[PDB]
Design a binder for this molecule. Structure first.
Ligand SMILES: [Cl-]
Ligand SMILES: [Cl-]
Ligand SMILES: [Cl-]
Ligand SMILES: [Cl-]
Ligand SMILES: [Cl-]
Ligand SMILES: [Cl-]
Ligand SMILES: [K+]
Ligand SMILES: [Mg+2]
Ligand SMILES: [Mg+2]
Ligand SMILES: [Mg+2]
Ligand SMILES: [Mg+2]
Ligand SMILES: [Mg+2]
Ligand SMILES: [Mg+2]
Ligand SMILES: [Mg+2]
Ligand SMILES: [Mg+2]
Ligand SMILES: [Mg+2]
Ligand SMILES: [Mg+2]
Ligand SMILES: [Mg+2]
Ligand SMILES: [Mg+2]
Ligand SMILES: [Mg+2]
Ligand SMILES: [Mg+2]
Ligand SMILES: [Mg+2]
Ligand SMILES: [Mg+2]
Ligand SMILES: [Mg+2]
Ligand SMILES: [Mg+2]
Ligand SMILES: [Mg+2]
Ligand SMILES: [Mg+2]
Ligand SMILES: [Mg+2]
Ligand SMILES: [Mg+2]
Ligand SMILES: [Mg+2]
Ligand SMILES: [Mg+2]
Ligand code: NA
Ligand code: NA
Ligand code: NA
Ligand code: NA
Ligand code: NA
Ligand code: NA
Ligand code: NA
Ligand code: NA
Ligand code: NA
Ligand code: NA
Ligand code: NA
Ligand code: NA
Ligand code: NA
Ligand code: NA
Ligand code: NA
Ligand code: NA
Ligand code: NA
Ligand code: NA
Ligand code: NA
Ligand code: NA
Ligand code: NA
Ligand code: NA
Ligand code: NA
Ligand SMILES: [Sr+2]
Ligand SMILES: [Sr+2]
Ligand SMILES: [Sr+2]
Ligand SMILES: [Sr+2]
Ligand SMILES: [Sr+2]
Ligand SMILES: [Sr+2]
Ligand SMILES: [Sr+2]
Ligand SMILES: [Sr+2]
Ligand SMILES: [Sr+2]
Ligand SMILES: [Sr+2]
Ligand SMILES: [Sr+2]
Ligand SMILES: [Sr+2]
Ligand SMILES: [Sr+2]
Ligand SMILES: [Sr+2]
Ligand SMILES: [Sr+2]
Ligand SMILES: [Sr+2]
Ligand SMILES: [Sr+2]
Ligand SMILES: [Sr+2]
Ligand SMILES: [Sr+2]
Ligand SMILES: [Sr+2]
Ligand SMILES: [Sr+2]
Ligand SMILES: [Sr+2]
Ligand SMILES: [Sr+2]
Ligand SMILES: [Sr+2]
Ligand SMILES: [Sr+2]
Ligand SMILES: [Sr+2]
Ligand SMILES: [Sr+2]
Lengths: 95, 160, 92, 186, 154
RNA sequence: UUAGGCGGCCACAGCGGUGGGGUUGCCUCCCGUACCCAUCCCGAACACGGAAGAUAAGCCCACCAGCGUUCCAGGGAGUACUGGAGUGCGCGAGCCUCUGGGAAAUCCGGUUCGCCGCCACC
RNA sequence: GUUUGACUGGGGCGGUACGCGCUCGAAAAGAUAUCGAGCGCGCCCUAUGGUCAUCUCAGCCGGGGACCCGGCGAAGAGUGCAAGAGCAAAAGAUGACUUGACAGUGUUCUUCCCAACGAGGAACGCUGACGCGAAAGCGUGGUCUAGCGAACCAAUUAGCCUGCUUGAUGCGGGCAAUUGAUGACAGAAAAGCUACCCUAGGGAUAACAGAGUCGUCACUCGCAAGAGCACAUAUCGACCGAGUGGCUUGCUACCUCGAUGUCGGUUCCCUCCAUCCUGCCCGUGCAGAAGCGGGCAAGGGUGAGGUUGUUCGCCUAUUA
RNA sequence: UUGAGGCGCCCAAAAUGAUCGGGACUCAAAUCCACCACCGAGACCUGUCCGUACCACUCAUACUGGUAAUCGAGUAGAUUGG
RNA sequence: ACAGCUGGUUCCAAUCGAAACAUGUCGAAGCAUGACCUCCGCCGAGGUAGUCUGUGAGGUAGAGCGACCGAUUGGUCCUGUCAAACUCCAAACUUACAGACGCUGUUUGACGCGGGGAUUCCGGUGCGCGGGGUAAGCCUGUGUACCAGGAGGGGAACAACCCAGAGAUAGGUUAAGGUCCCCAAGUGUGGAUUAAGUGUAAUCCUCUGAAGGUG
């Protein structure tokens, strides 16, 4: 990389396909997840607030509590355990 | 410079002019030759010059082969004969040269080339039955000035 | 950038919002009686004086904001983290 | 419409029925929405919670089912608005609903308007909705004093059908009383 | 049920291929295992395709191989009809062989080693550089084709 | 749902177009500014009050595929590309065989002129 | 007395790939180099921040490049600045109000994938006080990713701790935080010459020779425009295209720095053929004579001199 | 008359002595398509022994018996017995 | 004297067995902290190198562009081409979590935790994909296996090409490769081509041979 910033090489993952442009539907932004629930981490390009570091896009973590409205999701980066603060807008349920 | 320096397709596709400056103009005069007002379907015979290997042909070679091909067609059929030849490939790939040793090695722009795949039509001439052996000779002179071996394939010729 | 002389904000002393006045911190004069001043006179002898033989360095292209936020009622001031500004002018 | 890159808005936005930006803020409370709608002749008031395949309505009241309790006056006004709101809040109490947030939809938050009167009704029914007392109408305009005093500028009657001449805002008082009663078939 | 035979060594072989062969209880060259035909098991032999020799054996051939090369889970003891009878759920070698083919049980499940350690092919094989369709000995074989190899490796 | 309210998915729902539907019912347009409220000017809009009139808009209902879209069939194509293997071929660039996957364009023909949830309601 | 940095297809000059951000390189998770390609940041803004209300833009069309009315118009406008990305009843525009660009203290990610490491940054809370709104709510500065700085010392903010037996006064020492710069940006206070040189080492790295390469150089071949009074091909021969050699030059940095003696010359030996002469041939723009071009061919020959250290080259007279 | 394929030929000049490793080979000792039988590792199978690890017995790390298809190569280096 | 620089450092065996990389460094011939090797103590039932399926992530190959973007032909709708910094499309494949089978761990205690000791931070080669360069036995990435530190067999010789991973001894059968002699085994079989000694040369700095031409 020519720069070590957060949005380096994220043209693809943090961009919507033309038909998925504009404001995202609210139903998923207010979704309620319970502890122990396995959730899919994927940033919604239309939602600015409540994101995570793009390096974790594609992870399937485990919800272990919440901090305000955002969720504290437990993932494993390679071999290191990490706790990701993320809103419902960027999470989908497993199965 | 020899074609050995630029004939292979081992380099990336370098065509984006919005990032490349100082590109020399094409030595190619025209792609449409003969009677450019008449249609391609108005001719009973269609003969194409097909490239057998996947190569990069420079603008100078494209011109040198086109010139010695059309010049034969002008000599044998006249300046207004009943034929029409087309050079369907355009020189899009931009060429560099490192002309200081290997430090700051990315070269300066020196020319343009045409990436032609194997089995592709470089030239396509449309003629009448009587002028068929003249166009087969225009291509025999044209294939001598490019890099690969070629085929002279007749696409609409049941007249033999 | 331009900045208002007076505006409403939190007073960490009064525990409530009040109309504060802003002033650029005027440097206080040195006494020459601190420990460092005594070490200068002490540790300095023949030849090089080590740290005391050094001269003050250069400058950063733009300095940070060095303000004083004076409270309007209780009259006590507080300090805030400054920001880079080439020139800071006051409004009224 | 034009090609593949064209972005067609969400259905209820093409229809111009839902303010999706305001909806997100309304759903952030977690509390059920007190949907306050108004038509030309009528007024609707629903209690809506969030569901898996769409919204769920647990309790509602339309100004047409107000006549089932004794109303003999028009249904698209201020006294009707409060009552339809009181009737919605009362059915809500029976459904186990205790608190709510006011959804006025695409209506304007104009002081003393019908949607705020629908809210005043539900508050008086026992529901805990975040409000502002001075944005609501003064008790007499809710009662229907403005309408009775417009019939005072008579010459010709305000009402076509025979309800009464000088108009009775006392029917409001009588109806609030009928609904405030512990018995009543809801 | 297919019979796998490692015909190519471990040196220069990919680690993920090496580990698949170790998961299929086959650790040396000329070793043979009896693998069932599942989706999961087929994904494994496809990854080993170029370093192995597989195909379905005939009842006659499986018997010959089991008699000569099958070993208990521990020990030198020869696996004959009498051994089978006293330790397995069957009567003789044929009864076990029929079960292995019909995928009713495994060698491990019966207290036998999952590996039939074969002898080098008598008269040699058709080559370890080309597949069967090209005249070599790698990949999928005919039922008559695998027998020729299994029998030559008695 | 003999026309309603709030939604979910967010074009299969879009663009365009044809036919039908309303006496105290519904939705509208509609009528009208004393009030609440309203326009940097306009009761246009917003807000309030109301039925003299209407089904022409909207909306609801039925239908059309020309365009955009979703999916499917057949053709392109097991082609392009490709994970694994090779003492196969080629001066080389590159190609080929075996094994495991497998497009895109375009053509022809079907599909698609929304589906589903809660509530209320001759 | 010392200092006079590092990187680097050796070193120096140039440059900074020495701290940061974006696209591509990067091989459809993450990571990823070069003096890699395109190009930016070391601020600016009291609003260009914050909330609310009202509203929809570029562009085109029709009616009276300013302004007014209508229609088409999902986004090409605008949003402080690179680049990529986000945004339409808004994140843009207008209007009004407001100071959350607030104090305190955290959880977490990042800086530093994995995987330890500071400053810095961000996301997301709580406590306290506030702003706007009807309200849900929004405001931990600017829609997102650049806009940055340790210890020591000083100044500054508010309260408190503390100075040798003791009280008073003076002047000090400290807990918490703000500002002052180290851009060689995880921080030394810092110029050169040595051919008078010295040492430690290195073929980890240059000159020479070798080795690889062959762009350069030399030679050839394919096609044959063209001219040669007509005639391509007696002869000369462009463009373009295909190659052979390893004499020149350049590149690379594989070999040697506990040493493989320099250039030129000389002397003496062997060789190659792409042949200058000699032998045998073919063509001719071959009358002859003298040539011009080509083929086979390496037996023999290819010499003397003037300037120049020269190789090279220039010049003279002889010569098959 | 024209199309396609196979093998070869021309194109094809280098320095001490030519080369497929050499000899030498022509219905082959070359090339292509099939096939038959063999030679050939320390690999694979097999007898005995050794080391190491684990199990049984044991105070034992002393013996004895057992298991290893899933133990036996190694620079720097960590560990241990002699 | 000091040195981060060259040289040297003396007995046997058994177990495991690297790193030639990342962050910081007046740092690049050095260190520290991580990765990685080893040793000890602790914990106590799971683990995940392979595969399949399920629920997710992705815009490279290819393709295409009246799908944006920007290049790029001619004619009087048609007609001619392109993209590392384009995308209406779009793989193979890589990747998160989970289940299943497999394999593995519960006296061989895995997964994991804590502590002691390192070495190491000049790497190299093949293959795949690369970026730069006319090229290179070039420079610089990446995944992988190998040499380094890997014997033995084959390849004339020859770190990384093929076979093959190896205790001693012994018998046997094969692998790569080879069967005219040198030289173990065929002057083997059925059929065809070549007349150039083409050829008897997998891979290669190493084995050349091109455009063009051939009753
Ligand atoms: Cl994060
Ligand atoms: Cl200041
Ligand atoms: Cl409404
Ligand atoms: Cl011993
Ligand atoms: Cl091994
Ligand atoms: Cl010979
Ligand atoms: K030397
Ligand atoms: Mg990309
Ligand atoms: Mg056993
Ligand atoms: Mg044999
Ligand atoms: Mg073989
Ligand atoms: Mg109608
Ligand atoms: Mg080859
Ligand atoms: Mg000194
Ligand atoms: Mg240096
Ligand atoms: Mg850094
Ligand atoms: Mg990536
Ligand atoms: Mg200092
Ligand atoms: Mg100060
Ligand atoms: Mg630094
Ligand atoms: Mg020296
Ligand atoms: Mg060297
Ligand atoms: Mg000659
Ligand atoms: Mg001679
Ligand atoms: Mg002389
Ligand atoms: Mg020892
Ligand atoms: Mg020992
Ligand atoms: Mg492509
Ligand atoms: Mg080594
Ligand atoms: Mg012999
Ligand atoms: Mg030869
Ligand atoms: Na969206
Ligand atoms: Na330079
Ligand atoms: Na003193
Ligand atoms: Na004005
Ligand atoms: Na209508
Ligand atoms: Na310095
Ligand atoms: Na930090
Ligand atoms: Na000196
Ligand atoms: Na050459
Ligand atoms: Na050279
Ligand atoms: Na000399
Ligand atoms: Na001679
Ligand atoms: Na001379
Ligand atoms: Na060792
Ligand atoms: Na020193
Ligand atoms: Na370093
Ligand atoms: Na050093
Ligand atoms: Na490709
Ligand atoms: Na399992
Ligand atoms: Na290194
Ligand atoms: Na190894
Ligand atoms: Na050898
Ligand atoms: Na020969
Ligand atoms: Sr390349
Ligand atoms: Sr050619
Ligand atoms: Sr002193
Ligand atoms: Sr002094
Ligand atoms: Sr400065
Ligand atoms: Sr009106
Ligand atoms: Sr070539
Ligand atoms: Sr299939
Ligand atoms: Sr000095
Ligand atoms: Sr140099
Ligand atoms: Sr923000
Ligand atoms: Sr005292
Ligand atoms: Sr100077
Ligand atoms: Sr001098
Ligand atoms: Sr002669
Ligand atoms: Sr002289
Ligand atoms: Sr010279
Ligand atoms: Sr000269
Ligand atoms: Sr010769
Ligand atoms: Sr051993
Ligand atoms: Sr060992
Ligand atoms: Sr990848
Ligand atoms: Sr023979
Ligand atoms: Sr024969
Ligand atoms: Sr050599
Ligand atoms: Sr070759
Ligand atoms: Sr040829």
């Amino acid at each position: 990389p020519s720069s070590n910033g957060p949005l380096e090489g994220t043209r693809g993952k943090l961009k919507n396909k033309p038909r998925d442009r504009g404001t995202s539907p609210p139903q998923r932004a207010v979704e309620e997840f319970d502890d122990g629930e396995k959730v899919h981490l994927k940033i919604d390009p239309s939602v600015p607030n409540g994101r995570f570091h793009p390096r974790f896009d594609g992870q399937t973590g485990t919800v272990e509590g919440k901090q305000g409205d955002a969720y504290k999701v437990d993932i494993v980066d390679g071999g290191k355990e990490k706790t990701i603060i993320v809103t419902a807008a960027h999470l989908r349920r497993q199965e | 410079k020899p074609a050995s320096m630029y004939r292979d397709i081992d380099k990336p596709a370098y065509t984006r002019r919005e990032y490349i400056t100082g590109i020399p103009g094409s030595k190619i005069a025209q792609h449409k030759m003969g009677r450019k007002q008449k249609d391609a379907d108005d001719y009973p015979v269609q003969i194409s010059l097909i490239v057998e290997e996947t190569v990069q042909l420079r603008h100078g070679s494209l011109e040198a082969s086109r010139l010695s091909a059309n010049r034969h067609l002008i000599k044998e059929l006249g300046e207004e004969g009943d034929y029409k030849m087309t050079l369907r490939k355009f020189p899009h790939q931009v060429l560099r040269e490192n002309k200081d040793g290997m430090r700051a090695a990315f070269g300066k722009i020196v020319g343009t080339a045409a990436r032609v795949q194997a089995g592709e039509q470089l030239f396509t001439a449309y003629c009448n039955v009587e002028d068929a052996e003249h166009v087969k000779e225009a291509f025999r002179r044209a294939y001598n000035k490019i890099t690969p071996s070629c085929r002279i394939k007749v696409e609409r010729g049941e007249e033999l | 950038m331009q900045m208002p002389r007076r505006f409403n904000t939190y007073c960490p002393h009064c525990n409530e919002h009040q109309e504060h006045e802003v002033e650029k911190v005027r440097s206080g004069r040195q006494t020459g009686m601190k420990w460092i001043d005594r070490q200068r006179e002490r540790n300095s002898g023949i030849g090089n004086d080590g740290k005391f033989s050094k001269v003050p360095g250069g400058d950063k292209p733009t300095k940070k904001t060095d303000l004083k936020y004076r409270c309007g009622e209780c009259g006590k001031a507080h300090l805030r983290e400054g920001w880079r500004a080439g020139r800071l002018e006051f409004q009224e | 419409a034009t090609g593949p890159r064209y972005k067609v808005p969400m259905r209820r936005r093409r229809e111009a029925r839902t303010d999706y930006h305001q909806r997100l803020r309304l759903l952030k409370s977690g509390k059920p929405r007190l949907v306050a709608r108004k038509s030309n002749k009528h007024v609707r008031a629903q209690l809506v919670t969030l569901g898996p395949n769409g919204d769920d309505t647990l309790a509602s009241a339309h100004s047409s089912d107000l006549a089932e309790y004794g109303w003999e006056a028009p249904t698209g006004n201020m006294p009707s608005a409060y009552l339809t709101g009181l009737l919605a809040g009362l059915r809500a109490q029976e459904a186990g609903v205790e608190e709510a947030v006011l959804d006025i939809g695409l209506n304007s938050p104009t002081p003393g308007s019908k949607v705020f009167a629908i809210q005043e009704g539900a508050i008086d029914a026992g529901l805990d909705i975040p409000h502002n007392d001075d944005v609501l109408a003064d008790w007499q305009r809710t009662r229907g004093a403005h309408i009775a005093e417009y019939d005072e500028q008579l010459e010709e009657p305000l009402y076509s059908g025979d309800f009464d001449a000088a108009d009775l805002p006392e029917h409001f008082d009588e109806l609030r009383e009928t609904l405030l009663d512990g018995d009543i078939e809801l | 049920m297919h019979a796998l035979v490692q015909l190519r060594g471990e040196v220069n072989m990919h680690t993920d291929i090496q580990d698949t062969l170790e998961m299929l209880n086959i650790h040396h060259v000329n070793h043979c295992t009896l693998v069932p035909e599942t989706d999961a098991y087929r994904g494994m032999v496809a990854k080993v395709n170029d370093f192995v020799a597989f195909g379905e054996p005939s009842q006659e051939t499986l018997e010959t191989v089991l008699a000569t090369r099958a070993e208990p889970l521990e020990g030198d003891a020869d696996v004959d009809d009498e051994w089978v009878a006293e330790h397995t759920d069957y009567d003789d070698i044929s009864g076990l062989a029929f079960a292995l083919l019909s995928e009713e049980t495994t060698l491990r499940e019966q207290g036998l080693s999952p590996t039939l350690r074969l002898h080098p092919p008598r008269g040699g094989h058709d080559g370890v550089k080309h597949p069967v369709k090209e005249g070599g000995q790698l990949g999928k074989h005919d039922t008559e084709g695998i027998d020729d190899l299994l029998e030559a490796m008695r």
